Amino acid sequence: FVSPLPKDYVFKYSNEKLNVIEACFNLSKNGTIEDIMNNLRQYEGSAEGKAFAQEIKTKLLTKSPSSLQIALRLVQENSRDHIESAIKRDLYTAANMCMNQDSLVEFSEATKHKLIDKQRVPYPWTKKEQLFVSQLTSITSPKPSLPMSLLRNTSNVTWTQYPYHSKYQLPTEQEIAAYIEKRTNKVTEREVLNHFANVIPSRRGKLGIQSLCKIVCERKCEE
Amino acid sequence: IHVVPKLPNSKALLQNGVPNILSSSGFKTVWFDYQRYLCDKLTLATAGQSLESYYPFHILLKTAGNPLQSNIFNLASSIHNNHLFVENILPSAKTEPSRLFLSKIKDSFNGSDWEVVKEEMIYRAENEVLGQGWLFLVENNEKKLFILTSNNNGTPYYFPRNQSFDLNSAISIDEFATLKQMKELIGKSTKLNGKVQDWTMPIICVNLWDHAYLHDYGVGNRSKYVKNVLDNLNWSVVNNRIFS
Amino acid sequence: PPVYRLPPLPRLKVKKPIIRQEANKCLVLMSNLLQCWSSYGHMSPKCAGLVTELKSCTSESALGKRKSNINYHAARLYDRINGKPHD
Amino acid sequence: RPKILVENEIGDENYDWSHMLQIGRPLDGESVIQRTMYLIKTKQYGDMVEAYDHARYEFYALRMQEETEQQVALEEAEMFGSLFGVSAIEHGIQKEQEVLDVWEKKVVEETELMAA
Amino acid sequence: TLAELLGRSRIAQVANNHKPLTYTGKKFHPTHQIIETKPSTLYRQEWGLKSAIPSKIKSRYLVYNDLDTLERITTFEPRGGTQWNRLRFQEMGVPIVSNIGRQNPFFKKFNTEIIGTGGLSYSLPGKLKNSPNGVIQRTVVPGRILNLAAIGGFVADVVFFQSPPSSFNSMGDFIRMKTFLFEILEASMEKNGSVSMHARLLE
Amino acid sequence: ALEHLKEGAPLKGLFSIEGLQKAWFDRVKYLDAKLNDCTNEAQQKPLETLIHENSKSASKKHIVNYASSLYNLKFSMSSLQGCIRTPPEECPRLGPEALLQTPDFNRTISNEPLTTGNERLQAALISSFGSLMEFRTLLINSNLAISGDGFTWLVARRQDIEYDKLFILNTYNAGTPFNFSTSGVMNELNNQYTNMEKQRAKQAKTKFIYETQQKGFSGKEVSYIPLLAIDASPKTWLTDYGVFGKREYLERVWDSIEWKIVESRLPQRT
Amino acid sequence: PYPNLIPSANDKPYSSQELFLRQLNHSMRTAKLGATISKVYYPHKDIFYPPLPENITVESLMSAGVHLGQSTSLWRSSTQSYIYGEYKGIHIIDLNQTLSYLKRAAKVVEGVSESGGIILFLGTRQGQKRGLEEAAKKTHGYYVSTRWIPGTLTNSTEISGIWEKQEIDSNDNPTERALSPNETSKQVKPDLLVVLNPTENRNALLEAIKSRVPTIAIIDTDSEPSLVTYPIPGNDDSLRSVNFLLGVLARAGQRGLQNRLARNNE
Ligand SMILES: [Mg+2]
């Protein structure tokens, strides 16, 4: 039941913009929102890409710092760990946000400003500083004060990565890179496209897969 | 829809033009704009007709005999002739003229030199065509070559549309007799369309329209331009379009 | 106008197809001669060439020279040309 | 004016009906109608009839220009010693002639039949 | 949507009519849209219609009424003579002008009547036509006399200085065989859409 | 030669400081020099008279052609004047989109003779062409069609110097607008050819056809008094307007015609 | 090349053959010169360069003429779900539906080709033969243009008795060993019957369902869609629309064949 994309279709995220995102948002073990902002500030390359980076820095500034930091803290941990534990962690941090003991996540007021009161104008914020790592952990972790538990499924199963997503969507850059490496141990773009668009039985008739592969090749590999 | 073909080293051409004969602007005027314009006109003429599918040369050959739809013929003729001219010009895609070609020339022009032949061609160009036109060095079913001038969009291929001399001005007795003979030959053809057989092939087309020279050489100096073109042309291409 | 649709038939065919060939030349000449002899008495020389022409025609045999595929087409195209509803 | 109905890629086209003369499409009543529809959409002419008239008037000028082009091209050809073996009217006459010849022999035979 | 595409598309563009393909009455202008193929498309029997068209048809042009009928055949006739009449008229180059003192309709609820000419001529009357021999004053056209004269796909009224007996009376009702030259004076167009030409017999 | 144009400052309407020179001053020089090279005489005299003298002659052909070229250009330029529109040096050159633009000649009308007197001329034009707009369309479209070296001519049918009816004709490379000088040359050549053949019907029929084409409604021959010329050659308009701006150029020319001169040229009617 | 060409003397003009060769050379090098013609339909190009099932759109189907159903008066109401509306006294086939069914059909064609099944392309109409043969060539498959003798599958031993059978690798190499007379006489049934005019050969369809063979058909607005396993709604009368669908199917089967060959090589 799919259909091809129109002939005027252009992939919104250009190559230079993707490259600058890669440069900025990739972080080490102890990365921060502040570090990201610094990276954005000091990026150098294409003029359009620089303008984009500036724009995204501006919109980060506009948004709340504490929430962004919390999200940053969550995401690395979630990437490391398995689904159920990640869900539990998310639930715990939501609970903490709801019942802020330390008073360091101005959430309910911000929601009122936005959802209840008025759509226009951003919230001014009343808390802007670099939270400590221990504090961040406490924010996104449980305690014996309140009992917490997810509702039991029929299939009470736990896994580190999705069992059925990878087959039935467009193939990640990482998978393409792995394939290229395997091929190496000549290689060319057309051959790669054929492999992805014909050989793989789950991804034979994927819609914009060849274009994606071409974009990936443009971005990463060289002649 | 008819669109202009991608020339080899196009970006380089755009930057420079052609080393000796045509400037960056002058080359744009003759090709990157004028050729495009011609193609657009041809498309407009032949959008919904059966002619849309055919190439310019094949369109011209189809159209040649028809008195009406002469506009289509003219456009098609121009497009083909202009691209032949550009092909002749191009630096690459140093090459000398072929030995076979030289031997053929010698056979044709009473054992004269190639420089002499060039000089005769430029003289013909100067004298024959007033206003616009084309200057071909052609080869016919008799293996000898000859010089063929055309007055605006006259094709070297099909002799009834050679468009070789202007009856707007006064003409000679010999020319008139030749015309009469041609007409007779045409009448002798005996087909429903009424189209004779002809096997004339162009070897060196030159563009005597103002779209080539006028920017660089001014309103005069068309002869000089023609000479320059003759001096610096793609010889490999010429050699390729010579042997049977 | 009033259209007339037939029912489903076993086989559309004309019982006898007429070719409609031209009438014989010799017969025509004979008729002309007869007409001439009605006038001008029995055998006057006004019809001198006509009799000769008739003789020339009817020298080898009494007549000089000696089918339309319409059924094959009807038979071919009946099933198409029907307005017979689907199966 | 003959019409080719065998479609070229319907997806490939991209006509701005700001004007009539599109590239892949020829000049015809269709183009007029498309122009009328465009006018209606844009509300330059709120009324449909007025938009139609406007489109018709745009078409007419283009047609006149086309007509002039061909005639002048023919004139040019005549001037510069081009030779057309069979003109359209001459062709038509020739076509008529064969039919007439066919008729004549048949008609004579029919008259002979009638006589006898 | 699909519906929009259908409305745009080349079969929707052909305006429908159920006029007779065989009309033995008076034909003053084209009845049906002429439809051509390319040679390639003809070779594989494709005309851009509902069905394939019979391989018996070798002409590139045709006329039709129904894409498909109850008889399981497209109602068509393989002929496009009307284009040739128009082309002949163009060749003749006699510009149609309204003999009544009126403005040219192409310059400046619905009127179904024919707007000026039906589009056989968008030529304007003021031009001359030069040639090698000179400026053509009198338009020379070959035609056939019927009894009126058939002149390049149009019947035309005729006039002359003296009625020539040698050509006429030698073959009284076989005048159609011999082609005579004509000088076309002018072409008027009446309300019914008939082109009323007027010629003059040359000898 | 002309007064209204000069080398330093061209017309504000049509041409530019360099483009005008390319169109006119250089061309004229080229032609005159060529004419001098051909003929030992340096006396200009009239051009028309020279053409009449040397017409119907293959030996004296080139000179005639050069005279025609010179005369036609001069005739074109005499008609022209200044304009309201901006110079092409300021404006941008038209691209491939110019081809697809609908012309406004059918609907719009501008710069008529009536606005600067010239009433009788306008009436004559109307009589000839039905209307002013119709005339304009006939003129401009014809000029566009020429596509090459040529000239569009508004003319008057000479039968005091009386005239019958106004007309318009195109003429190419170095063709004269006067019919009488070249009328029946082809027929004469045909006759000569027939004589030569005899020395060594269909031909008679062709001759008869030629004769009837040539001869008018009454008089032995016909001639045309030119009132307006408009050049069609790339030489003029390629410099300013580029390839695609021929129509624009023609429009500009039309806007900037001095109709008083045309009216003066127009003789009395019968 | 051209070993028997007797070339004319240098003093003499070109011979007829020599002239023809010169013309051919000109055509190859410099005839298709002046311009290039983008966006135009060549009939042959649909047979030799059909698009993949993915890249087909509704617009392409409409251009092909697949949307044009039989007629308003020749309506099998069994086919009601497939039809979009009526226009010009003709039912018009819903083309999104057509697309989805075509894709489904294309996938099954690919699958049987991959498995190494015998695909059989049946097309009794006049112009269909050449394109049918091309499709059959594309996948290592079979076709029928000259009429289907009733009982090729049901009564196989009588009809298809005296024709040569073969052996085949995991690749498509003849591996020419002698087939035993017992080994030869067994029926060789198709694993996909694909018809271009199911309304004209009901019989073939009936034997397929008796003989237990899945079948694909271009169901027009007068055809029974229940008579086949995988109906593609569309215009079976026009030659070019059929070719387009058929060519697509061939391409799908070709792909599957290529994949099978690749996995054999592996
Ligand atoms: Mg059917």
Coordinates of N, CA and C in Angstrom, one line a residue, chain E residues 12-145:
Chain E
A12 N -10.4 13.3 -21.6 CA -11.2 14.3 -21.1 C -11.2 15.6 -21.9
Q13 N -10.0 15.9 -22.5 CA -9.7 17.0 -23.3 C -10.5 17.0 -24.6
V14 N -10.7 15.8 -25.2 CA -11.5 15.7 -26.4 C -13.0 15.8 -25.9
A15 N -13.6 16.9 -26.4 CA -15.0 17.3 -26.0 C -16.0 16.3 -26.7
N16 N -16.8 15.7 -25.8 CA -17.7 14.6 -26.3 C -18.8 15.1 -27.3
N17 N -19.1 14.2 -28.2 CA -20.3 14.4 -29.1 C -20.8 13.1 -29.7
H18 N -22.1 13.1 -30.0 CA -22.7 11.9 -30.6 C -23.3 12.3 -31.9
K19 N -22.6 13.1 -32.7 CA -23.0 13.5 -34.0 C -22.6 12.4 -35.0
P20 N -23.4 12.2 -36.1 CA -23.0 11.1 -37.0 C -21.6 11.2 -37.6
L21 N -20.9 10.1 -37.7 CA -19.7 10.0 -38.4 C -19.9 10.1 -39.9
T22 N -21.0 9.3 -40.3 CA -21.6 9.5 -41.7 C -22.7 10.5 -41.7
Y23 N -22.4 11.7 -42.2 CA -23.4 12.7 -42.4 C -23.4 13.1 -43.8
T24 N -24.4 12.7 -44.6 CA -24.6 12.9 -46.0 C -25.1 14.3 -46.3
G25 N -25.6 15.0 -45.3 CA -26.0 16.4 -45.5 C -24.9 17.4 -45.8
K26 N -25.2 18.7 -45.7 CA -24.2 19.7 -46.0 C -23.2 19.9 -44.9
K27 N -21.9 19.8 -45.3 CA -20.8 19.9 -44.3 C -20.1 21.3 -44.5
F28 N -20.3 22.2 -43.6 CA -19.8 23.6 -43.7 C -18.5 23.7 -42.9
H29 N -18.3 22.9 -41.9 CA -17.1 22.9 -41.0 C -17.0 21.5 -40.3
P30 N -15.8 21.2 -39.8 CA -15.5 20.0 -39.0 C -16.6 19.7 -38.0
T31 N -16.9 18.4 -37.9 CA -17.9 17.8 -37.0 C -17.1 17.3 -35.7
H32 N -16.1 16.5 -36.0 CA -15.4 15.8 -34.9 C -13.9 16.2 -34.8
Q33 N -13.4 16.1 -33.6 CA -12.0 16.3 -33.3 C -11.2 15.2 -34.1
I34 N -10.3 15.6 -34.9 CA -9.3 14.7 -35.6 C -8.3 14.2 -34.5
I35 N -7.9 13.0 -34.6 CA -7.0 12.4 -33.6 C -5.9 11.6 -34.4
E36 N -4.7 12.1 -34.3 CA -3.6 11.4 -34.9 C -2.8 10.5 -34.0
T37 N -2.1 9.6 -34.5 CA -1.0 8.8 -33.8 C 0.3 9.2 -34.3
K38 N 1.4 8.7 -33.7 CA 2.7 8.7 -34.3 C 2.8 7.4 -35.1
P39 N 3.8 7.2 -35.9 CA 3.9 5.9 -36.6 C 4.3 4.8 -35.7
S40 N 5.1 5.0 -34.7 CA 5.5 4.0 -33.8 C 4.3 3.4 -33.0
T41 N 3.5 4.3 -32.5 CA 2.3 4.0 -31.8 C 1.2 3.2 -32.6
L42 N 1.1 3.7 -33.9 CA 0.3 3.0 -34.9 C 0.7 1.5 -35.1
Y43 N 2.0 1.4 -35.2 CA 2.7 0.0 -35.4 C 2.2 -1.0 -34.3
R44 N 2.1 -0.5 -33.1 CA 1.5 -1.4 -32.0 C 0.1 -0.9 -31.6
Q45 N -0.7 -0.6 -32.7 CA -2.1 -0.3 -32.6 C -2.7 0.6 -31.5
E46 N -1.8 1.5 -31.0 CA -2.2 2.3 -29.8 C -2.5 3.8 -30.3
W47 N -3.7 4.2 -30.0 CA -4.2 5.5 -30.3 C -4.4 6.5 -29.1
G48 N -4.2 5.9 -27.9 CA -4.5 6.6 -26.7 C -6.0 6.6 -26.4
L49 N -6.7 5.5 -26.8 CA -8.1 5.3 -26.5 C -8.2 4.1 -25.5
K50 N -9.4 3.8 -25.2 CA -9.8 2.6 -24.3 C -9.1 1.3 -24.8
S51 N -9.3 1.0 -26.0 CA -8.9 -0.2 -26.6 C -7.8 -0.1 -27.7
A52 N -7.3 -1.2 -28.2 CA -6.5 -1.2 -29.4 C -7.4 -1.0 -30.6
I53 N -6.9 -0.4 -31.7 CA -7.7 -0.2 -32.9 C -7.2 -1.2 -34.0
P54 N -8.1 -1.7 -34.8 CA -7.8 -2.8 -35.7 C -6.5 -2.5 -36.6
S55 N -5.7 -3.6 -36.8 CA -4.5 -3.5 -37.6 C -4.8 -3.2 -39.1
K56 N -6.0 -3.4 -39.5 CA -6.5 -3.0 -40.9 C -6.3 -1.5 -41.1
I57 N -6.5 -0.7 -40.1 CA -6.3 0.8 -40.2 C -4.8 1.0 -40.3
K58 N -4.3 1.6 -41.4 CA -3.0 2.0 -41.7 C -2.8 3.6 -41.7
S59 N -3.9 4.3 -41.8 CA -3.9 5.8 -41.7 C -3.6 6.2 -40.2
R60 N -2.8 7.3 -40.1 CA -2.4 7.8 -38.7 C -3.5 8.6 -38.1
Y61 N -4.4 9.1 -38.8 CA -5.5 10.0 -38.3 C -6.8 9.2 -38.2
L62 N -7.7 9.7 -37.3 CA -9.1 9.2 -37.3 C -10.0 10.1 -36.6
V63 N -11.3 9.7 -36.5 CA -12.4 10.5 -35.8 C -13.2 9.4 -35.0
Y64 N -13.6 9.8 -33.8 CA -14.5 8.8 -33.0 C -15.6 9.5 -32.2
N65 N -16.5 8.7 -31.8 CA -17.7 9.1 -31.0 C -17.6 8.5 -29.6
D66 N -17.5 7.1 -29.5 CA -17.6 6.4 -28.3 C -16.3 5.6 -28.1
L67 N -15.7 5.7 -26.9 CA -14.5 4.9 -26.5 C -14.8 3.4 -26.5
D68 N -16.0 3.0 -26.1 CA -16.4 1.7 -26.1 C -17.9 1.7 -26.2
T69 N -18.5 0.8 -27.0 CA -20.0 0.6 -27.1 C -20.5 -0.7 -26.6
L70 N -21.8 -0.9 -26.6 CA -22.4 -2.1 -26.3 C -22.1 -3.2 -27.3
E71 N -21.8 -2.8 -28.5 CA -21.3 -3.8 -29.6 C -19.9 -4.3 -29.4
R72 N -19.2 -3.8 -28.4 CA -17.8 -4.1 -28.1 C -16.8 -3.7 -29.2
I73 N -17.1 -2.5 -29.7 CA -16.3 -1.8 -30.7 C -16.3 -0.3 -30.5
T74 N -15.2 0.3 -30.6 CA -15.1 1.8 -30.6 C -15.8 2.3 -31.9
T75 N -16.6 3.3 -31.8 CA -17.3 3.9 -33.0 C -16.3 5.0 -33.5
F76 N -15.6 4.6 -34.6 CA -14.7 5.5 -35.2 C -14.8 5.5 -36.8
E77 N -14.1 6.4 -37.4 CA -13.9 6.5 -38.8 C -12.5 6.9 -39.1
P78 N -11.7 6.1 -39.8 CA -10.3 6.5 -40.1 C -10.1 7.5 -41.2
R79 N -10.4 8.8 -40.8 CA -10.2 9.9 -41.8 C -10.1 11.3 -41.0
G80 N -9.1 12.1 -41.5 CA -8.9 13.4 -41.0 C -8.7 14.4 -42.2
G81 N -9.7 14.4 -43.0 CA -9.7 15.3 -44.2 C -9.8 16.8 -43.9
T82 N -10.5 17.1 -42.8 CA -10.7 18.5 -42.4 C -9.5 19.3 -42.2
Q83 N -8.4 18.7 -41.7 CA -7.1 19.4 -41.5 C -6.5 19.8 -42.8
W84 N -6.7 18.9 -43.8 CA -6.1 19.2 -45.2 C -6.8 20.3 -45.9
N85 N -8.1 20.4 -45.7 CA -8.9 21.5 -46.2 C -8.4 22.8 -45.6
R86 N -8.2 22.9 -44.3 CA -7.7 24.0 -43.6 C -6.3 24.4 -44.1
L87 N -5.4 23.4 -44.3 CA -4.1 23.6 -44.8 C -4.1 24.2 -46.3
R88 N -5.0 23.6 -47.1 CA -5.2 24.1 -48.4 C -5.6 25.6 -48.4
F89 N -6.6 25.9 -47.6 CA -7.1 27.3 -47.4 C -5.9 28.3 -47.0
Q90 N -5.1 27.8 -46.1 CA -3.9 28.6 -45.6 C -3.0 28.8 -46.8
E91 N -2.7 27.8 -47.6 CA -1.8 27.9 -48.8 C -2.4 28.9 -49.8
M92 N -3.7 28.8 -50.1 CA -4.3 29.8 -50.9 C -4.1 31.2 -50.5
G93 N -4.2 31.4 -49.2 CA -3.7 32.7 -48.6 C -4.7 33.8 -48.8
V94 N -6.0 33.5 -49.0 CA -7.0 34.5 -49.2 C -7.6 34.7 -47.8
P95 N -7.4 35.9 -47.2 CA -7.8 36.2 -45.8 C -9.3 36.4 -45.7
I96 N -9.9 35.7 -44.8 CA -11.3 35.8 -44.5 C -11.6 37.1 -43.8
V97 N -12.5 37.9 -44.4 CA -12.9 39.2 -43.7 C -14.5 39.2 -43.8
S98 N -15.1 39.7 -42.8 CA -16.5 39.9 -42.7 C -17.0 41.0 -43.7
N99 N -17.7 40.6 -44.7 CA -18.2 41.6 -45.7 C -19.2 42.6 -45.1
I100 N -19.8 42.3 -44.0 CA -20.6 43.3 -43.2 C -19.6 44.1 -42.4
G101 N -19.9 45.4 -42.3 CA -19.1 46.4 -41.6 C -19.1 46.1 -40.1
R102 N -18.2 45.3 -39.6 CA -18.0 44.8 -38.2 C -16.6 44.7 -37.8
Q103 N -16.3 44.9 -36.5 CA -15.0 44.7 -36.0 C -14.6 43.2 -36.0
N104 N -13.2 43.0 -36.1 CA -12.7 41.6 -36.1 C -12.9 41.0 -34.7
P105 N -13.7 39.9 -34.6 CA -14.0 39.3 -33.3 C -12.8 38.9 -32.3
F106 N -11.7 38.6 -32.9 CA -10.5 38.2 -32.2 C -9.9 39.3 -31.4
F107 N -10.1 40.6 -31.7 CA -9.7 41.8 -31.0 C -10.8 42.3 -30.1
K108 N -10.5 43.3 -29.2 CA -11.4 44.0 -28.4 C -11.0 45.4 -28.1
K109 N -25.6 34.1 -21.1 CA -24.2 34.3 -20.7 C -23.2 34.0 -21.8
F110 N -23.2 32.7 -22.2 CA -22.4 32.2 -23.2 C -23.0 32.2 -24.6
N111 N -22.3 32.5 -25.6 CA -22.8 32.5 -27.0 C -22.2 31.3 -27.8
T112 N -23.0 30.3 -28.1 CA -22.6 29.1 -28.8 C -22.3 29.3 -30.3
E113 N -22.7 30.4 -30.9 CA -22.4 30.8 -32.3 C -20.9 30.9 -32.6
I114 N -20.6 30.8 -33.8 CA -19.2 30.7 -34.3 C -18.5 32.1 -34.2
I115 N -17.5 32.2 -33.4 CA -16.8 33.5 -33.1 C -15.9 33.9 -34.3
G116 N -16.4 34.7 -35.2 CA -15.7 35.1 -36.4 C -15.7 33.9 -37.4
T117 N -14.5 33.5 -37.8 CA -14.2 32.2 -38.4 C -14.1 31.2 -37.3
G118 N -14.3 29.9 -37.7 CA -14.2 28.8 -36.7 C -12.7 28.5 -36.3
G119 N -11.8 29.3 -36.8 CA -10.3 29.0 -36.6 C -9.6 28.3 -37.7
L120 N -10.2 28.3 -38.9 CA -9.6 27.9 -40.1 C -8.5 28.9 -40.6
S121 N -8.8 30.2 -40.3 CA -7.8 31.2 -40.6 C -7.8 32.2 -39.5
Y122 N -6.6 32.4 -38.9 CA -6.2 33.5 -38.0 C -5.3 34.5 -38.8
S123 N -5.4 34.5 -40.1 CA -4.6 35.4 -40.9 C -5.3 36.8 -41.0
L124 N -4.5 37.8 -41.1 CA -5.0 39.2 -41.1 C -4.9 39.7 -42.6
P125 N -5.9 40.6 -43.0 CA -6.1 40.9 -44.4 C -5.1 41.8 -45.1
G126 N -4.3 42.6 -44.3 CA -3.5 43.7 -44.8 C -2.2 43.3 -45.5
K127 N -1.8 42.1 -45.5 CA -0.4 41.7 -46.0 C -0.4 41.5 -47.5
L128 N 0.8 41.7 -48.1 CA 1.2 41.2 -49.4 C 2.2 40.1 -49.3
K129 N 2.4 39.4 -50.4 CA 3.2 38.2 -50.4 C 4.2 38.3 -51.6
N130 N 5.4 38.7 -51.3 CA 6.5 38.8 -52.3 C 7.1 37.4 -52.7
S131 N 7.7 37.4 -53.9 CA 8.3 36.2 -54.4 C 9.5 36.6 -55.3
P132 N 10.3 35.7 -55.8 CA 11.4 36.0 -56.8 C 10.8 36.8 -58.0
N133 N 9.7 36.3 -58.6 CA 9.1 37.0 -59.7 C 8.5 38.3 -59.4
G134 N 8.0 38.5 -58.2 CA 7.6 39.8 -57.7 C 6.5 39.7 -56.6
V135 N 5.7 40.8 -56.4 CA 4.6 40.8 -55.4 C 3.4 40.3 -56.1
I136 N 2.8 39.2 -55.5 CA 1.7 38.5 -56.1 C 0.4 39.3 -55.9
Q137 N -0.1 39.8 -56.9 CA -1.4 40.6 -56.9 C -2.6 39.6 -56.9
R138 N -2.6 38.7 -57.9 CA -3.6 37.7 -58.1 C -3.2 36.3 -57.7
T139 N -4.0 35.7 -56.8 CA -3.7 34.4 -56.3 C -4.2 33.3 -57.3
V140 N -3.2 32.6 -57.8 CA -3.5 31.5 -58.8 C -3.6 30.2 -58.1
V141 N -4.8 29.5 -58.3 CA -5.1 28.3 -57.7 C -5.8 27.3 -58.7
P142 N -5.3 26.1 -58.8 CA -6.0 25.1 -59.7 C -7.3 24.5 -59.0
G143 N -8.3 24.4 -59.8 CA -9.6 23.9 -59.3 C -10.3 23.1 -60.4
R144 N -11.5 22.5 -60.1 CA -12.3 21.8 -61.0 C -13.7 22.4 -61.1
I145 N -14.3 22.5 -62.3 CA -15.6 22.9 -62.5 C -16.5 21.7 -62.5

